Protein backbone atom coordinates (compact mmCIF):
# COMPACT_ATOMS: atom_id res chain seq x y z
CA UNK A 1 0.00 0.00 0.00
CA UNK A 2 2.98 2.26 0.80
CA UNK A 3 4.75 0.42 -2.00
CA UNK A 4 2.10 1.50 -4.53
CA UNK A 5 2.12 5.16 -3.37
CA UNK A 6 3.92 8.39 -4.34
CA UNK A 7 4.54 11.55 -2.35
CA UNK A 8 3.65 14.67 -4.32
CA UNK A 9 5.47 17.68 -2.90
CA UNK A 10 4.55 21.33 -3.56
CA UNK A 11 0.74 21.26 -3.74
CA UNK A 12 -1.40 24.35 -3.11
CA UNK A 13 -4.75 24.72 -1.28
CA UNK A 14 -6.58 24.93 -4.64
CA UNK A 15 -5.58 21.35 -5.52
CA UNK A 16 -8.67 19.13 -5.90
CA UNK A 17 -8.56 15.32 -5.79
CA UNK A 18 -10.29 15.32 -9.22
CA UNK A 19 -7.39 17.33 -10.68
CA UNK A 20 -4.49 15.51 -9.08
CA UNK A 21 -5.85 12.19 -10.31
CA UNK A 22 -6.36 13.54 -13.84
CA UNK A 23 -2.67 14.67 -13.73
CA UNK A 24 -1.55 11.07 -13.15
CA UNK A 25 -4.43 9.25 -14.86
CA UNK A 26 -1.94 8.56 -17.68
CA UNK A 27 0.32 6.36 -15.46
CA UNK A 28 -2.27 3.82 -14.43
CA UNK A 29 -5.36 3.23 -12.35
CA UNK A 30 -5.50 5.26 -9.12
CA UNK A 31 -7.16 3.95 -5.93
CA UNK A 32 -6.90 6.92 -3.57
CA UNK A 33 -5.84 10.57 -3.52
CA UNK A 34 -4.97 12.19 -0.22
CA UNK A 35 -4.22 15.92 -0.15
CA UNK A 36 -2.76 17.44 3.08
CA UNK A 37 -2.52 21.27 3.48
CA UNK A 38 -1.08 23.33 6.37
CA UNK A 39 -1.75 26.82 4.91
CA UNK A 40 -5.05 27.91 3.34
CA UNK A 41 -4.15 31.29 1.89
CA UNK A 42 -0.99 33.25 1.05
CA UNK A 43 2.02 31.10 0.26
CA UNK A 44 0.79 27.46 0.23
CA UNK A 45 2.24 24.51 2.17
CA UNK A 46 1.19 20.99 1.39
CA UNK A 47 1.71 17.73 -0.39
CA UNK A 48 -0.48 14.82 -1.41
CA UNK A 49 -0.30 11.05 -1.69
CA UNK A 50 -1.29 9.14 -4.80
CA UNK A 51 -1.87 5.43 -4.21
CA UNK A 52 -2.02 3.52 -7.48
CA UNK A 53 -3.66 0.14 -8.00
CA UNK A 54 -0.55 -1.54 -9.41
CA UNK A 55 3.06 -1.03 -8.28
CA UNK A 56 4.32 -0.55 -11.90
CA UNK A 57 2.60 2.89 -11.88
CA UNK A 58 5.03 4.16 -9.18
CA UNK A 59 8.16 3.83 -11.40
CA UNK A 60 6.02 5.27 -14.25
CA UNK A 61 4.85 8.32 -12.21
CA UNK A 62 8.46 9.39 -11.43
CA UNK A 63 8.38 10.76 -15.03
CA UNK A 64 6.28 13.67 -13.72
CA UNK A 65 8.81 14.78 -11.11
CA UNK A 66 9.52 18.48 -11.77
CA UNK A 67 6.39 18.67 -13.95
CA UNK A 68 4.14 21.76 -13.88
CA UNK A 69 0.95 21.04 -12.00
CA UNK A 70 -1.49 23.91 -11.38
CA UNK A 71 1.24 26.41 -12.34
CA UNK A 72 3.80 25.04 -9.88
CA UNK A 73 6.49 22.43 -10.32
CA UNK A 74 5.86 19.33 -8.25
CA UNK A 75 8.26 16.90 -6.55
CA UNK A 76 7.34 13.23 -7.17
CA UNK A 77 9.13 10.65 -4.96
CA UNK A 78 7.93 7.13 -3.99
CA UNK A 79 6.56 6.75 -0.46
CA UNK A 80 8.99 3.82 -0.10
CA UNK B 1 -4.34 15.86 17.11
CA UNK B 2 -7.17 13.31 16.81
CA UNK B 3 -8.60 14.98 19.95
CA UNK B 4 -8.55 18.21 17.90
CA UNK B 5 -9.81 16.90 14.52
CA UNK B 6 -13.29 16.52 13.02
CA UNK B 7 -14.29 13.97 10.38
CA UNK B 8 -16.19 15.43 7.45
CA UNK B 9 -18.20 12.97 5.33
CA UNK B 10 -19.84 13.82 2.00
CA UNK B 11 -17.08 16.04 0.67
CA UNK B 12 -17.56 16.60 -3.09
CA UNK B 13 -14.47 15.48 -5.04
CA UNK B 14 -14.09 19.00 -6.45
CA UNK B 15 -13.47 20.42 -2.97
CA UNK B 16 -10.27 22.30 -2.19
CA UNK B 17 -8.65 22.72 1.23
CA UNK B 18 -9.10 26.49 0.99
CA UNK B 19 -12.85 26.06 0.32
CA UNK B 20 -13.15 23.66 3.26
CA UNK B 21 -11.21 25.97 5.59
CA UNK B 22 -13.43 28.91 4.46
CA UNK B 23 -16.50 26.82 5.34
CA UNK B 24 -15.12 26.11 8.79
CA UNK B 25 -13.31 29.42 9.50
CA UNK B 26 -16.03 30.53 11.93
CA UNK B 27 -15.40 27.61 14.30
CA UNK B 28 -11.80 28.50 15.13
CA UNK B 29 -8.22 28.38 13.94
CA UNK B 30 -7.44 25.40 11.60
CA UNK B 31 -3.99 23.67 11.54
CA UNK B 32 -4.44 21.13 8.80
CA UNK B 33 -6.89 20.01 6.14
CA UNK B 34 -6.71 16.45 4.82
CA UNK B 35 -8.89 15.48 1.85
CA UNK B 36 -9.32 11.80 1.00
CA UNK B 37 -11.15 10.65 -2.12
CA UNK B 38 -11.43 7.05 -3.44
CA UNK B 39 -13.61 7.32 -6.63
CA UNK B 40 -12.92 9.45 -9.74
CA UNK B 41 -15.95 8.83 -11.96
CA UNK B 42 -19.19 10.84 -12.17
CA UNK B 43 -19.65 13.33 -9.36
CA UNK B 44 -18.51 11.19 -6.45
CA UNK B 45 -17.79 12.16 -2.86
CA UNK B 46 -14.90 11.54 -0.50
CA UNK B 47 -14.16 12.85 2.96
CA UNK B 48 -11.95 15.21 4.94
CA UNK B 49 -10.37 15.58 8.35
CA UNK B 50 -10.25 19.08 9.77
CA UNK B 51 -7.61 19.61 12.45
CA UNK B 52 -8.08 22.67 14.66
CA UNK B 53 -5.63 24.58 16.89
CA UNK B 54 -7.96 24.20 19.90
CA UNK B 55 -10.01 21.31 21.39
CA UNK B 56 -13.02 23.64 21.96
CA UNK B 57 -13.33 24.38 18.23
CA UNK B 58 -14.38 20.79 17.50
CA UNK B 59 -17.57 21.07 19.58
CA UNK B 60 -18.35 24.40 17.90
CA UNK B 61 -17.81 22.86 14.44
CA UNK B 62 -20.36 20.11 15.23
CA UNK B 63 -23.05 22.78 14.53
CA UNK B 64 -22.19 22.59 10.83
CA UNK B 65 -23.33 18.94 10.61
CA UNK B 66 -25.93 18.58 7.80
CA UNK B 67 -24.89 22.02 6.51
CA UNK B 68 -24.62 22.52 2.74
CA UNK B 69 -21.22 22.36 1.03
CA UNK B 70 -20.79 22.08 -2.77
CA UNK B 71 -24.28 20.67 -3.29
CA UNK B 72 -24.15 18.14 -0.47
CA UNK B 73 -25.07 17.95 3.17
CA UNK B 74 -21.85 17.22 5.04
CA UNK B 75 -21.51 14.91 8.05
CA UNK B 76 -19.50 16.38 10.92
CA UNK B 77 -18.42 14.29 13.88
CA UNK B 78 -15.30 14.21 16.09
CA UNK B 79 -12.55 11.95 14.63
CA UNK B 80 -13.19 8.31 15.66
Domain boundaries, chain A: 1-80
Is B30's Cβ below 8 Å from some Cβ in A? yes
Alpha helix ranges (H) inside chain A: 17-24, 56-61
Identify the burial level of B2 via C-beta atoms within 10 angstroms of its C-beta, where 0-12 means exposed, 13-18 middle and 19 or more buried: exposed
Q: How was this structure determined?
A: X-ray
Beta bridge partners of A72: A69
Gap between the Cα atoms of B57 and B61, Å rounded: 6
- Cα dihedral value A50, B45, B58, A49, nearest 10: 0
What is the stated resolution of the deposited model, in angstroms? 2.8
* CA distance, residue A19 to nearest chain B CA (Å): 8
* Range B1-80 has CATH code 3.30.70.330: yes
Phi, psi at residue A21, to the nearest 5°? -55, -65
Compare CB distances from B32 to A14, A16, A38 and report the shortest one's residue: A38
Amino acid sequence: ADARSIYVGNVDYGATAEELEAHFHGCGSVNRVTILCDKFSGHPKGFAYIEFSDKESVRTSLALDESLFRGRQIKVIPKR
